[PDB]
Design a protein around this ligand. Sequence first.
Ligand SMILES: Cc1nc(CN2CCC(CN)CC2)cs1
Length: 211
Amino acid sequence: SMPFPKDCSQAMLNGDTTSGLYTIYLNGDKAQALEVFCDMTSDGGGWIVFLRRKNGRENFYQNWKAYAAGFGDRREEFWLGLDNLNKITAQGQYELRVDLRDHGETAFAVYDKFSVGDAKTRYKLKVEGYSGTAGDSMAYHNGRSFSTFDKNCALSYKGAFWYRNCHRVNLMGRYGDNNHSQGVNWFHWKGHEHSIQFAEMKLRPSNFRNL
Ligand SMILES: Cc1nc(CN2CCC(CN)CC2)cs1
């Protein structure tokens, strides 16, 4: 086992094949512990989950400081934090996976390259190299800074995201809200008048597939 695994891929290879809460260590530093939910089952596992929507119990209409730090219950609905995502994605080349489920239908998107810049970039999104069944709805968002109501699409749609003008992905939108562009949307799968029941965003090293 690795003593200070830097992501859920290093924590998995530690043999641990059950999804749930694990400690990772940013940059392998024992003083930078972070509790994360590891999805150890989806497409070979090793995924740090950083967003989960499943029941509408948690409020995602939150401010910059909340999006920077993270909020919620890692075992249920939560947001890991942009500062965490920046520090994880700085460690190497990561891939993004998005898992969606709504009334029994499932879809996914993988982006071979995923990074989140630091606070001086307003946590700029990079997403490249799409494959999947959900449809490439993140391309629209590529290179955009993060937006909250206090730093306007966030205000106008009551969510938070790497907004442009405004969105094709709104996974931090209002749960069960089928009003145009208000809900948990992935436009190229279910459009803007269909709020998705279940959504996860997760990351792991892009080289995991052949390590
Ligand atoms: C007493 C505290 N509550 C939190 C909330 N959230 C931040 C940790 C995690 C994101 N990195 C999701 C949950 C942090 S410290």
